[PDB]
Amino acid sequence: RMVGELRDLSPDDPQVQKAAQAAVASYNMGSNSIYYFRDTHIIKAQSQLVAGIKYFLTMEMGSTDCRKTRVTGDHVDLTTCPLAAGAQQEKLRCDFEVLVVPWQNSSQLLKHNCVQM
């Protein structure tokens, strides 16, 4: 078995960004809201070395005006989805654990825990 150091990374790190996008996309596939949520801010980002790499992300999200009825996943561009304003506006502070392995393309959201703000 292989277990490594838990290290702090920059939120702007390009591989942290991909992990975040995989974390958000997985949340939307399993969330109860009609609207797609979107990452607004990445607060903290750590990485741990395993047979692969685990990414421990603390990040803020926001509900959008984009709906699952009108737009399907895998074909949704969250950059074209505006944050909902008033009445619907819902914010979440989420902890994400993203596993990335070399033999796979799709990263996995292994665990999550969101908390309204």
Numbering used by the authors: 8 to 124
Reproduce the article's own wording on this structure:
The cysteine protease legumain can develop asparaginyl endopeptidase (AEP) and carboxypeptidase (ACP) activities in a pH- and context-dependent manner. Primarily found in endolysosomes, legumain is involved in immunological processes such as antigen processing and TLR maturation as well as in tumor progression.
The crystal structure of hCE revealed the typical five-stranded antiparallel β-sheet wrapped around a central α-helix. Two disulfide bridges additionally stabilize the structure by clamping strands β4 and β5 and the hCE-specific appending structure that is inserted between strands β3 and β4. We compared the affinity of glycosylated hCE and non-glycosylated (E. coli produced) hCE towards cathepsin B and found that the affinity of cathepsin B towards glyco-hCE (IC50=5.7±1.3 nm) is two times higher than towards E. coli hCE (IC50=9.3±2.4 nm).
